[PDB]
Design a protein around this ligand. Structure first.
Ligand SMILES: Nc1ncnc2c1ncn2[C@@H]1O[C@H](COP(=O)(O)OC(=O)[C@H]2CSC(c3nc4ccc(O)cc4s3)=N2)[C@@H](O)[C@H]1O
Length: 539
């Protein structure tokens, strides 16, 4: 019973007191006192914000927000591509106990309206690139009182820039050294409102508390579960800051004093040059970029000798792709994490000294996990596939103003049901099979796209893959694949089909065929768009 529940270990050291704003303040202040430390670096522009500058900006903005009239448990929003200024309003709000609602900068107007109607922010911090769409929607949304432009040094058309907002609402002689963030009940006060559709339904707002965040801050500094690079090391992330994957990794990087090199769009040459030129030792990727590291000839053109911590998350990573990356970079293994918006951050992480190729790691401190039978709901033992469920101190407070949806994902016993199929081995390493809804319904079988995608990615001419079921009169769904070929290489549909058939049981064959495409349709955290795949595989 409880014999089959898997528990994270003790944290290496106990949880630090204080709110997430108090812990961020202490960390920014520490690094600001060491000469030359840099917090944020824009790979496209080479512009930096130092830890000293970030401390100044976040404290001055917090004071400005208080004088503007914001109180604890008011809400602001941030709608912006990854840039140097994104986290200035995030951290300032956490200082004063104002909830932060990051909003996808690529949202349509209708998606924007639906997200903002949940969080109802009083102020929206936008970028030059999102200003127009935020202006459009604001006309319909009475609760928005103020727009602030993050990355302009001048006001635009009646809308104020960040620097002029701070100048208006704080005294120029404001003493940063004495500023103190607010103390409040970290178990109750919401820190972030993040967008997630969850296991079913329309997009919702996930409430994460300051307690959820400081538990993440415990993990990221933990000698076993944390990043294995020392303060001041350069780390390069390609993950959108408005998603939990990018939000709670990047916030943790500040507490570690890393130099965070960011991009607002991925470009292969700039990515590699940036790893080389900033002597990057750690990088945070999605599986498509792991395949790039494993297979691209471009990698050999750059000096990547400093890179030693290569991390993936967001979607299933093929065992063989991870092994190929580790081999090519002469590393003992790769780093991986698994989590959901609803669990704040990764709740399974590859621990220091403990790698198992194909496994996304072990349960983190302050968490427990179980695997439940899809039919009975009974708890399963090792090497038995079922739905992964989790309990621990980063589980969300719930969905904003949606207790019904909250109860559908967190059961009456307190377990969050992830919607993912997986298993754990005799040593506690967890393996993610696929999202339950992604399984292909071929007759009475359930075939996992990630299993077929992993085989496809074993082929030396295949650099990306996406598998789904296409509709079929007789069988319901036929497994079918979109394949991206390495430039200069050639494969026929028949070659790909036979390659897979030689390795899989009859039910898993690509009876729906293969299409060759220039890119797999995937989201910004690696989620494969199965509907987009079907549209290609029907045409
Ligand atoms: N490793 C994985 N293997 C297979 N499937 C995966 C994996 N990770 C996610 N999923 C799928 O993603 C679905 C949730 O999707 P979401 O709610 O949009 O949130 C998210 O993805 C974000 C929420 S924090 C998170 C992470 N923080 C870290 C920190 C370090 C690191 O080194 C890696 C990571 S990853 N992920 C979930 O249910 C699966 O189906």
């Amino acid at each position: 019973e409880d014999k089959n529940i898997v528990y994270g270990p003790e944290p290496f050291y106990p949880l630090e007191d204080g709110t997430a704003g108090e812990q961020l303040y202490k960390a920014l202040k520490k690094y600001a006192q060491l000469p030359g430390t840099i917090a944020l670096t824009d790979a496209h522009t080479e512009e930096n914000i130092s830890y000293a500058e970030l401390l100044e900006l976040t404290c001055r903005l917090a004071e400005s927000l208080k004088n503007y009239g914001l109180k604890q448990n008011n809400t602001i929003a941030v709608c912006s591509e990854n840039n140097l200024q994104f986290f200035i309003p995030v951290i300032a709000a956490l200082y004063i106990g104002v909830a932060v609602a990051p909003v996808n900068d690529k949202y349509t107007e209708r998606e924007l309206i639906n997200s903002l109607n949940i969080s109802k922010p009083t102020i929206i911090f936008c970028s030059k690139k999102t200003l127009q769409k935020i202006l459009q929607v604001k006309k319909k949304l009475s609760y928005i009182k103020k727009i602030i432009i993050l990355d302009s040094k001048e006001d635009i058309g009646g809308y104020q820039c960040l620097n002029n907002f701070i100048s208006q609402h704080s005294d120029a002689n404001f003493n940063v050294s004495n500023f103190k963030p607010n103390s409040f009940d970290r178990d109750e006060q919401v820190a972030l409102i993040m967008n997630s559709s969850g296991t079913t339904g329309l997009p919702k707002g996930v409430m994460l508390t300051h307690k959820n965040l400081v538990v993440r801050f415990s993990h990221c500094r933990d000698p076993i579960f944390g990043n294995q690079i020392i303060p001041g090391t350069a780390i390069l992330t390609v993950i959108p800051f408005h998603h939990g994957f990018g939000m709670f990794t990047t916030l943790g990087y500040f507490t570690c004093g890393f130099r965070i090199v960011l991009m607002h769009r991925f470009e292969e040459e700039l990515f590699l040059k940036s790893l080389q030129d900033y002597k990057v030792q750690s990088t945070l990727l999605v599986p498509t970029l792991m395949a790039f590291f494993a297979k691209s000839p471009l990698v050999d053109k750059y000096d990547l000798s400093n890179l030693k911590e290569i991390a993936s998350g967001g979607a299933p990573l093929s065992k063989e792709v991870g092994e190929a990356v580790a081999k090519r970079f002469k590393l003992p293994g790769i780093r991986q994490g698994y989590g959901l918006t609803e669990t704040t951050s990764a709740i399974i992480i590859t621990p220091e000294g403990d790698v198992k190729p194909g496994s996304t790691g072990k349960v983190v401190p302050f968490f427990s996990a179980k695997v439940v039978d899809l039919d009975t709901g009974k708890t399963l033992g090792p090497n038995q596939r079922g739905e992964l469920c989790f309990k621990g101190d980063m589980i969300m407070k719930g969905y904003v103003n949606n207790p019904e949806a909250t109860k559908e994902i967190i059961d009456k016993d307190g377990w969050l049901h992830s919607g993912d199929i997986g298993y754990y081995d005799e040593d506690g390493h967890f393996f993610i099979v696929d999202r339950l809804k992604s399984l292909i319904k071929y007759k009475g079988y359930q075939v996992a796209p990630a299993e077929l995608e992993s085989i496809l990615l074993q082929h030396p001419s295949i650099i990306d893959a996406g598998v789904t079921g296409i509709p079929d009169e007789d069988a319901g769904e036929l497994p079918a694949a979109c394949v991206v070929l390495q430039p200069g290489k050639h494969l026929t549909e028949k070659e790909v089909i036979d390659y897979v058939a030689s390795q899989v049981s009859s039910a898993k064959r690509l009876r729906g065929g293969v299409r060759f495409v220039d890119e797999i349709p995937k989201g910004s955290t690696g989620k494969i768009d199965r509907k987009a795949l079907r549209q290609i595989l029907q045409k």
